[PDB]
Design a protein around this nucleic acid. Structure first.
Ligand code: MG
Ligand code: MG
Ligand code: MG
Ligand code: MG
Ligand code: MG
Ligand code: MG
Ligand code: MG
Ligand code: MG
Ligand code: MG
Ligand code: MG
Ligand code: MG
Ligand code: MG
Ligand code: MG
Ligand code: MG
Ligand code: MG
Ligand code: MG
Ligand code: MG
Ligand code: MG
Ligand code: MG
Ligand code: MG
Ligand code: MG
Ligand code: MG
Ligand code: MG
Ligand code: MG
Ligand code: MG
Ligand code: MG
Ligand code: MG
Ligand code: MG
Ligand code: MG
Ligand code: MG
Ligand code: MG
Ligand code: MG
Ligand code: MG
Ligand code: MG
Ligand code: MG
Ligand code: MG
Ligand code: MG
Ligand code: MG
Ligand code: MG
Ligand code: MG
Ligand code: MG
Ligand code: MG
Ligand code: MG
Ligand code: MG
Ligand code: MG
Ligand code: MG
Ligand code: MG
Ligand code: MG
Ligand code: MG
Ligand code: MG
Ligand code: MG
Ligand code: MG
Ligand code: MG
Ligand code: MG
Ligand code: MG
Ligand code: MG
Ligand code: MG
Ligand code: MG
Ligand code: MG
Ligand code: MG
Ligand code: MG
Ligand code: MG
Ligand code: MG
Ligand code: MG
Ligand code: MG
Ligand code: MG
Ligand code: MG
Ligand code: MG
Ligand code: MG
Ligand code: MG
Ligand code: MG
Ligand code: MG
Ligand code: MG
Ligand code: MG
Ligand code: MG
Ligand code: MG
Ligand code: MG
Ligand code: MG
Ligand code: MG
Ligand code: MG
Ligand code: MG
Ligand code: MG
Ligand code: MG
Ligand code: MG
Ligand code: MG
Ligand code: MG
Ligand code: MG
Ligand code: MG
Lengths: 81, 87
RNA sequence: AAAGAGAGUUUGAUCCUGGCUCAGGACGAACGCUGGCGGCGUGCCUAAUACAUGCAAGUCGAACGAACGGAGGUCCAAAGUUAGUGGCGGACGGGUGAGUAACACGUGGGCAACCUGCCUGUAAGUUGGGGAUAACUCCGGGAAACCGGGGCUAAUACCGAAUGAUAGAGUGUGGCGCAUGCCACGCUCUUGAAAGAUGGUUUCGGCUAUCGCUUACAGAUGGGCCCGCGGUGCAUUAGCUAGUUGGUAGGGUAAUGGCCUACCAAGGCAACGAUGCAUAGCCGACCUGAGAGGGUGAUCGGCCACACUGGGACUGAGACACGGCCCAGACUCCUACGGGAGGCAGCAGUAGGGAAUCUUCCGCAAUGGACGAAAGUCUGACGGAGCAACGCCGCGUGUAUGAAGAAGGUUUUCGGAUCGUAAAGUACUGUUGUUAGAGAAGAACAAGGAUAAGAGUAACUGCUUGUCCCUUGACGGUAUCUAACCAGAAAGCCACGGCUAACUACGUGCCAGCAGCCGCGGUAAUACGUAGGUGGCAAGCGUUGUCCGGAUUUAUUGGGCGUAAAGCGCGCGCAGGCGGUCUUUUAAGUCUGAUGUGAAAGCCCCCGGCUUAACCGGGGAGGGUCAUUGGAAACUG
């Protein structure tokens, strides 16, 4: 880059990329664990389900997911049990 | 959304339109709804304005500019807006 | 109210048919001769070819790092007005027309299938903890872009907790719709929030003002998707397609949808032109035309696509992002040979292509943008200046008088005619010009100080409105005005046989040459060159290129087919086009009223402002086989 603002913007870009990737990976792993539990047997599943929804709701407060996305995922994975 | 002042006319002879438009659009480009005229060349300023659509836009959240604020103050739109807010 | 011009050319002469040529208007135009000024506009149409040089996007100390005067110790000096992390903006503004024959654009709708930072209003809240990290400082790799390691520290930086959903489920009640479904309300459980900074008062605790941050609901704004109709050449381009066509489940997105996956069936489009090739951004609009139509997309406004070529994602409300990032490709540059940097279709400017297109200028004064509480910073947007008769409009190079007629050219039937009242003389003026001076509007402000009144408060501080005080010009001594002098410093181009306005002489002799056509030139040339004269236009005049007219020469308006070009050799017949008489009924066509819309600018009408005009401003009118809806039933259905 050859503008003093572009370098700061790109640095902030890598920082935000790392942060958002970490939280998104955590949320996907929680969803994966819940759907693995729900697909096979019953076991806790529902006990997992709650915190899975948590991983979505807090994510909306972070700003890395739309509110409609969180509601849609919660409703769609709530139909497994 | 701002009730802005659009410039046209001729070289060294400007004439102005009091118009409402978005701040991201060109000065002479797209606008929403023109409301008045403003002529600076004459020593007594001749400003005509609807004074009814202006109050509606002010109620709806259309912040004016400095000179537009001055014109609305002199013509009494700002004082009537304050009265409407109180009443 | 509007309402249309023709001429030459086939023949020994005619009348028809038919083509060719010319008389008019308009350019982002070019070339030749010439050239005084003012106002308003326009200027790479070709190579989306390659780019030196400078500037075009930064800003916040009210969240964390300055010199001086100067506490203190004749010497050094503590506290008081100025880098970066973080927030916002870089997606606006500006430039090109490559690509694209498609929901790209125009017009009219739908979303009970959607999103939206900043802006406005309302209802609640801003309660408690933690672990770090730049900056900074040491150790190394370093040719250099810069890389790693150790230590140290802040926050409106980051991450948990208390509490709060109209978020998910389960349910109930009532009212409803355009099938899917929409609206109001109620019940139980499970999840999701915050940040503080500048002041005031008080007691200092508290309380409070402004700007801030979190959640929810409306408005406004900007976008997303779907659909009816409309705007090109080729059939010497006839089949095309397979996630294609539909369904059952699922994934994904803000949202519907083969957008994507698995399964099932073989569908779908096409002579009302599918598929393919070629060209091309679309519109408001511009040129022409009596009009219908024909040609084009210069300037300006709206939408779309692109940013050296091709692909991809991150951050963000909004990008798959001109002056942001990663990879590959071509080119330019540096290297210590390990590796690095770049993208003017931004404003000026250079090279190349062209028949052809401009200064490497001034300023944020005005309007508008980004940041901030404000002062304020940035703004090649924009406001201005420079170049080019490139276009439109306006003005001048004098005015009156001056004779059977100055002087001298051109001719002469050698008496004369002609330039010609044109000259000299005579009387007058300064629009331009020279000299010397007075000299505006564009300016509203913002902020700062007083005020007066409101809401809020225990009180303030502050906030909103109103009235005053002070300050601000690149253009620029610019427009403009006032005086003195001066006919002096300011006219050219084309044409003259007919079309078409305007003729004499000399020279030449089918040569030199002219030419849009009829055609002129061989010894008496109004057509070749020159001189005199005359005609048209005028700081312009001619030539060329493209479009429309004339051209009824694609004829709906508005032509034809015996002999001039033009009836298939004839028949049977699918689709299509058309269809005897009367009655009842329907409103698809038809005719009409009302609602919404067809942006601004442009043509047109009426008013105005510039000393007139060009130009500018206000109001009005025009334009649709347009959507909702009410009417009539003669005609076609
Ligand atoms: Mg939490
Ligand atoms: Mg959302
Ligand atoms: Mg202003
Ligand atoms: Mg002719
Ligand atoms: Mg010329
Ligand atoms: Mg010359
Ligand atoms: Mg001029
Ligand atoms: Mg070009
Ligand atoms: Mg700083
Ligand atoms: Mg743009
Ligand atoms: Mg274009
Ligand atoms: Mg902490
Ligand atoms: Mg710490
Ligand atoms: Mg620390
Ligand atoms: Mg709770
Ligand atoms: Mg509740
Ligand atoms: Mg409905
Ligand atoms: Mg309730
Ligand atoms: Mg929590
Ligand atoms: Mg404030
Ligand atoms: Mg703040
Ligand atoms: Mg059209
Ligand atoms: Mg067209
Ligand atoms: Mg589905
Ligand atoms: Mg093209
Ligand atoms: Mg024009
Ligand atoms: Mg005609
Ligand atoms: Mg055009
Ligand atoms: Mg252009
Ligand atoms: Mg345009
Ligand atoms: Mg570019
Ligand atoms: Mg290039
Ligand atoms: Mg994102
Ligand atoms: Mg950019
Ligand atoms: Mg560039
Ligand atoms: Mg340029
Ligand atoms: Mg050159
Ligand atoms: Mg400015
Ligand atoms: Mg400003
Ligand atoms: Mg700058
Ligand atoms: Mg400019
Ligand atoms: Mg300019
Ligand atoms: Mg030129
Ligand atoms: Mg001119
Ligand atoms: Mg003239
Ligand atoms: Mg003279
Ligand atoms: Mg004279
Ligand atoms: Mg005289
Ligand atoms: Mg003689
Ligand atoms: Mg005379
Ligand atoms: Mg003098
Ligand atoms: Mg002076
Ligand atoms: Mg002077
Ligand atoms: Mg006040
Ligand atoms: Mg005041
Ligand atoms: Mg005053
Ligand atoms: Mg004062
Ligand atoms: Mg002052
Ligand atoms: Mg100022
Ligand atoms: Mg100056
Ligand atoms: Mg000067
Ligand atoms: Mg002057
Ligand atoms: Mg004198
Ligand atoms: Mg003299
Ligand atoms: Mg003079
Ligand atoms: Mg004189
Ligand atoms: Mg004279
Ligand atoms: Mg002259
Ligand atoms: Mg001759
Ligand atoms: Mg002559
Ligand atoms: Mg003449
Ligand atoms: Mg015709
Ligand atoms: Mg005929
Ligand atoms: Mg016949
Ligand atoms: Mg025949
Ligand atoms: Mg026959
Ligand atoms: Mg025959
Ligand atoms: Mg037959
Ligand atoms: Mg038939
Ligand atoms: Mg009938
Ligand atoms: Mg209009
Ligand atoms: Mg315009
Ligand atoms: Mg007038
Ligand atoms: Mg006009
Ligand atoms: Mg007008
Ligand atoms: Mg008008
Ligand atoms: Mg009209
Ligand atoms: Mg009947």
């Amino acid at each position: 880059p050859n503008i003093k603002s572009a370098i700061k913007r790109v640095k902030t870009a890598e920082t935000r990329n790392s942060r958002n990737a970490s939280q998104r990976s955590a949320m996907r792993t929680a969803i994966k664990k819940f759907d693995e539990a729900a697909a096979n047997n019953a076991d806790n599943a529902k006990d997992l389900y709650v915190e899975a929804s948590k991983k979505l709701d807090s994510a909306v407060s972070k700003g890395l997911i739309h509110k409609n996305n969180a509601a849609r995922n919660k409703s769609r994975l709530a139909a497994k049990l | 959304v701002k009730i802005r002042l659009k410039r046209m006319g001729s070289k060294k002879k400007p004439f102005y339109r009091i118009v409402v438009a978005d701040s991201r659009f060109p000065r002479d480009g797209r606008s929403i709804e023109t409301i008045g005229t403003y002529n600076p060349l004459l020593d007594p300023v001749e400003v005509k304005i609807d004074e009814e659509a202006t109050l509606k836009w002010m109620h709806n959240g259309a912040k004016p500019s400095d000179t537009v604020r001055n014109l609305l103050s002199r013509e009494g739109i700002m004082e009537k807006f304050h009265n409407q807010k109180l009443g």
